[PDB]
Ligand binder design. Structure first.
Ligand SMILES: CN(CC(=O)O)C(=O)c1ccc(F)cc1
Lengths: 412, 412
């Protein structure tokens, strides 16, 4: 019989701060983490701004010797994980290490390191490729390195489902616990795609906002004048724990994870369907999994990428799933402030949805100056909204028509 | 309590063949798929050979237009997937499309595409990066394209667990069906890394055999003269199906997937512990999941990569799990013939484990001329061994200490 799963620890790096509370204070103040990128010369690029992690000190977590071997996305995922585990108060023992696993994912993983080693190969030759090229760049090594540093011998894996990765990672980790394959999982995602290939690759697809003039105003989900997503870096990690296990050790419980939905659009490799049919199927799957009436949903943390087709598809999916109740819930895109952390987006947004439950506040959609046609829901324009939230939903949609929905509720 | 999961379709590209029966004929003949890599200047590389897919015709599967947009590893995964679905005879309908999903993964993903776009970026700047660079290179696009092409609306995701990916993808797909999240899944893995960054990256770590003078003898698991693994390309895919679903439509059933195990070594980034303690836990977990005693195992498809430390760790793990029955089971490494398909290794080896059951024959470990110290099990040296096989395991042990075991049984 299926066990209940609760959130006992959370950890983050985002464009708004180097931990959860600093990121969350920025979210509730309506602060933007988007700025011109300083780490490289981007005059040749149509987009020259993004959400960078500012002032990250990897030596808060790892020796300089080890850090040098690891792509930033792995450094970011370990930081978030180490925070989440510390925040949980869990002690790893011989009695429990086989029951604790990790599922930290990434959309693209070690693209900076792969580019750097590619430049070495092309300019010099294969003799100049780093010996750490593979273990320092491949996506499964957040889970790998985290298990090595903390002694976690439970299920050890990584998802890579593009912009859905962090939501899927958290959902399937919950399934592991629910079905008895583990008692604790560290789950979420990490991303640092801000290199020549990532900025150039998304730019070649004309997927990014090109508002270089006002980087902080570029991410404007459901605004009439949106022109694509803002590329952002960082990590989110959550400690998921079986309810009785958490109760038994006197753990602080943030919220319960009650529902998870997946669906494939089977529509298009990059475009969502205009009517959000895939998103609707996924949200209904998640609400049925949670045993809910759709009217119980109080807050939705939207995918809300600031893409013309993506944003309107989500309105359509929410109206389809919730009917008249769509006008009573609050829905916001924290990507208005953070930009789009890709494989990490679902991980930081899960955390923001849990904090919305803790603090009974809907985060704003900043930059929502002129809501587009049919975008007439409560999208929490401009300013945080204190309100009752018993049930919070976090949505992600990705390339390949992959959808994920997590349902969290307050724990009594 | 859980639904039963059977194999109804299989698909493959390997260094031995462009399908399952050609590959399996090569396996039972002890044929090698390893040869000097062509159409590439490997003068400056310490390893000049590997397991290429020979004569792949992508236009049997995709238009020229679609093929040009996708990395070889995505082409290979879709080829295996289409083969597997065709082999299953399954008919996708509006009635069943929400119950059919995909979990096709990769260890390292789009290195060829990343190389080619790096060349464009370094030589001409970012304006020459392909618009399709991102969707055409990310690991989840086998699941994505397959779901779009066949109209699959079930769970759509992709794992990336380095050399464990294929084993994990199949096991987790089996869980989706067992726990009623899907009735059908296409699962496995694909890889094309016997390319510049793959050979250069693994060669920098001195992980590869450098036996350039005798490429067919380089992969020699448990042989005293082994000097590292052989890099290989290809794909494997299985149609996994709920038993009553398969019976109702009169599907041909190859075997039953009865057990799945996962563990973490929590030991080292690339090397297993000398005693294979993590591999032991994983095999135990898989047998307990199947409700089977170690005495019931007849055949193990080893991970058996031809690394010094990895091969001996597996011997220690199997002696620990199976005690005196370790000498009565048969264990072989088909990597002696195929080399190491990394993320696809567990997919093609799951298929060889299924065909070991179908045909009642243990594939050989070729090149096992002088078994090393402690390597005194029935390693099916040199020649295929007809024998009774009721229960077959397939092991994968990957970077980050991530372990997977599948347990297959004859169906009746
Ligand atoms: C180079 N090192 C570090 C070390 O020996 O200490 C590795 O572990 C290693 C890296 C990649 C690989 F394919 C195999 C091995």
């Amino acid at each position: 019989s299926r066990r209940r799963v609760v959130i006992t620890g959370m950890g983050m790096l985002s464009p708004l701060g180097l931990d959860v509370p600093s990121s969350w204070e920025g979210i509730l103040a309506g602060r933007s983490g988007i700025a011109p990128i300083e780490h490289m010369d981007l005059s040749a690029y149509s987009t020259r701004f993004g959400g960078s992690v500012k002032g990250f000190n990897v030596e808060e977590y790892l020796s300089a010797k080890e850090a040098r071997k690891l792509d930033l996305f792995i450094q970011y995922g370990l930081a978030a994980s180490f925070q989440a585990v510390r925040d949980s108060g869990l002690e790893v023992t011989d009695a429990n290490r086989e029951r604790i696993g990790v599922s930290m994912g990434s959309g693209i993983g070690g693209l900076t390191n792969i580019e750097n080693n590619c430049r070495s190969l092309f300019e010099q030759g294969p003799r100049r490729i780093s010996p750490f090229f593979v273990p320092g760049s491949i996506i499964n090594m957040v889970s790998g390195f985290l298990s090595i540093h903390l002694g976690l011998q439970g299920p050890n894996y990584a998802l890579t489902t593009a912009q859905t990765t962090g939501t899927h990672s958290i959902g399937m980790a919950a399934r592991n616990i629910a079905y008895g394959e583990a008692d604790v999982m560290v789950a979420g995602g990490s991303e640092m795609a801000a290199c020549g290939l990532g900025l150039g690759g998304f730019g070649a697809a004309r997927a990014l906002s090109t508002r270089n003039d006002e980087p902080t105003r570029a991410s404007r989900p459901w605004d009439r004048d949106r022109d694509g997503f803002v590329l952002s870096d960082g990590s989110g990690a959550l400690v998921l724990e079986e309810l009785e296990h958490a109760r038994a050790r006197g753990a602080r419980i943030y919220a319960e994870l009650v529902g998870f939905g997946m669906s494939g659009d089977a529509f298009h490799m990059t475009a969502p369907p205009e009517d959000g049919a895939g998103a609707a199927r996924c949200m209904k799957n998640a609400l049925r999994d949670a045993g809910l009436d759709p009217r119980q949903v109080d807050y939705i943390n939207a995918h809300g990428t600031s893409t013309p087709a993506g944003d309107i598809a989500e309105i359509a999916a929410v109206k389809s799933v919730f009917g008249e109740h769509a006008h009573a819930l609050s829905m916001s895109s924290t990507k208005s402030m953070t930009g789009h952390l890709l494989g990490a987006a679902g991980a930081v947004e899960a955390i923001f949805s849990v904090l919305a439950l803790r603090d009974q506040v809907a985060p704003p959609t900043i930059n929502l100056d002129n809501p587009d046609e049919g975008c007439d829901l409560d999208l929490v324009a401009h300013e945080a909204k204190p309100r009752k939230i018993d049930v919070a939903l976090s949505n992600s949609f990705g390339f390949g028509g992959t959808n994920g929905t997590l349902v969290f509720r307050r724990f009594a």
